[PDB]
């Protein structure tokens, strides 16, 4: 209903309000010391899905190598932007380059550049440039017949990777059991792996490399950003009507007519809430009322067929989508599936 009542209180345009309400862009509620493009992130700042993912989960990219060709880099070797990881593909960011799937494992036995063909249904259990004791498994397989083990001690080298993954992260090798696990978030100075012996120097999400015996911290921030009416509801709850009224009253002293007209319209809505006693957050629904059934009847007619009102179908759609969201949340569905359900629930209420 133009002009928007929610938008007037929150100083948001119609375009901005629709983007947040229908799950198009994020809005910042707590920056948590995040820097985007060299500029610190402020509150009430609109972020795109690409920008939010970079700040929350870090930056990384994978480059698929052509068959047969071999990369000129090593595992765990740092690269710079534009550096040629492979002759056929170039990188687009700086970070640590790690092998994804070595199509051929060239174990150097010590008694020996023996060549092993690794099928896609097989996985390597030892890292590159590592000492493997005699009798230990080297490449695991579904069928024990095709399983490859270590004939003797030697150095295992990886060759012909399927692709190279470049992730902007910091590697901290650990000696003893790690005090954190995969999925945790750390800050500079926190005890990382060896009970304080190894500590992180940057914010990020920690993932544990058991095979490589290193701890990786992908640079990111624990930023608080939300979409939908949930983020709008919290903003309305934190509003101070008394403080806002004083601020708008001072702006009313501007000699410019345009500013005075703008401040008067906002102050009219603020005063209406103060006098009536209503709360701004009541404009967002938590419980949906249901009309009495006799006002939306389902009655039989002189014959045998039934007749019903359109409101019963609209109520059925809302219940069906609300119940499906409860089941999806309990199963730990990914955010993409959850976000689609929430957007559909908002449209059903409309």
């Amino acid at each position: 209903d133009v002009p928007s009542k929610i938008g007037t209180l929150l100083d948001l345009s119609a375009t901005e309000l629709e983007q947040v309400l229908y799950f198009s862009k994020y809005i910042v509620l707590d920056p948590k010391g995040a820097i985007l493009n060299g500029v610190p992130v402020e509150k009430r700042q609109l972020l795109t899905d690409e920008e939010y993912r970079e700040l929350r989960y870090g930056k990384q990219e994978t480059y698929p190598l052509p068959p047969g060709v071999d990369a000129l880099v090593k595992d765990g070797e740092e690269v710079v932007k534009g550096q040629e990881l492979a002759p056929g593909v170039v990188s687009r960011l700086d970070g640590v380059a790690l092998y994804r799937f070595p199509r051929r494992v060239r174990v150097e036995y010590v008694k020996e550049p023996k060549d092993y063909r690794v099928q896609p249904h097989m996985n390597v259990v030892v890292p590159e440039g590592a000492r493997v004791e005699a009798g230990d498994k080297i490449v695991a397989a579904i069928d024990p017949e095709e399983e490859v083990i270590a004939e003797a001690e030697g150095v295992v080298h990886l060759h012909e990777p399927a692709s190279i993954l470049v992730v902007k992260a910091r590697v901290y090798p650990f000696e003893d059991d790690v005090e954190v696990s995969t999925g945790d978030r750390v800050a500079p100075g926190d005890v990382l792996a060896d009970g304080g012996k190894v500590k992180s120097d940057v914010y990020g999400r920690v993932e544990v490399d058991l095979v490589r015996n290193v701890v990786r911290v992908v640079e990111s921030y624990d930023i608080d950003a939300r979409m939908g009416a949930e983020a709008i509801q919290q903003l309305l709850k934190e509003l101070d009507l008394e403080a806002l009224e004083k601020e708008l009253l001072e702006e009313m002293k501007h000699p410019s007519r345009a500013r005075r007209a703008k401040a008067r319209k906002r102050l009219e809505v603020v005063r209406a809430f103060l006098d009536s006693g209503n709360r701004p957050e009541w404009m967002i629904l938590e419980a949906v009322p249901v009309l009495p059934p006799d006002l939306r009847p389902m009655v039989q007619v002189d014959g045998g067929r039934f007749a019903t009102s359109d409101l019963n179908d609209l109520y059925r759609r809302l219940i069906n989508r609300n119940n499906r969201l409860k089941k999806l949340l309990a199963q730990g569905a990914p955010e993409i599936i959850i976000r689609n359900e929430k957007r559909m629930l908002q449209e059903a209420v409309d």
Binding site: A162, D177, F306, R316, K327, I336, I337, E341, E347
Partner: protein, 334 residues
Amino acid sequence: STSDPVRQYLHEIGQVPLLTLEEEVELARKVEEGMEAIKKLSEITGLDPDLIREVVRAKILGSDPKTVEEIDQKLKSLPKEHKRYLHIAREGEAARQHLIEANLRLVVSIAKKYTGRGLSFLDLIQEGNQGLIRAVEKFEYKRRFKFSTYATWWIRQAINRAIADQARTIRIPVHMVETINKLSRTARQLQQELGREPTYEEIAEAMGPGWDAKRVEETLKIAQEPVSLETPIGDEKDSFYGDFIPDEHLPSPVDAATQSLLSEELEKALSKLSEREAMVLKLRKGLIDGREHTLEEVGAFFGVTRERIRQIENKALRKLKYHESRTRKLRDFL
């Protein structure tokens, strides 16, 4: 822009690259190993296996929260040998999230073949996504079969069950919905062979044993959908179906006035009876509190046997009959 919810969803799922064969195997192996580690952790720690997977899932997802932190700290206090299974559980939960996200294109291709059967396209996709999640848990990568071979069965099943449960205003059981679909399919085949609409007898014979024409007609009556009250009638948009349906529930003014006239005339005739005689009839017929009272409760209230009330109740009835015949004041009400 953003006016099409279907276009918005397609753009979002297109940002996840499709998995290669090598990548698919690794994710499937990680999920299976993680599930086994959860079972191993529960046996050692003695806690519920269902509860442990939630604590691991909560940490991976991020953002009762009070007890989640408490249980997680106990797991991290285990020695190095037991802490290894914690690492496997965490990696398995992250692989399950990535495995589901990379197969969202498969459900859209399947779900587009079920449109026009009572559910919107977005509703079909969401129901198919539930089937995709189920296939991930039950998938076994040791058989060397590709994921799309096994996941297709679960995605199609979820869409079919949702249609049979949510596409009708008056819900019909799944077993009867299948019967209705078979009945319609059989009639169509007979129609193109006979060159005309088949009769109920012809449909019943082709349906199979245990079917007669009576059962065919009864099934067709069940499969009738209700009609809308706001259906426009005529070209001008001022008349609707609900403008022609009377209400038969509330009594009419004529019916309400007849009840009042009967009551005042009945109580006038009761005054000709004795004080005790009138009370017996008013209780044995239920003119107080609305409930009829048997010869026992009436006897309990008045402290007399049930054979005595029977006679006086009948005696008062016969005196009313004589009075009515001489005046004819209570006959028109029947």
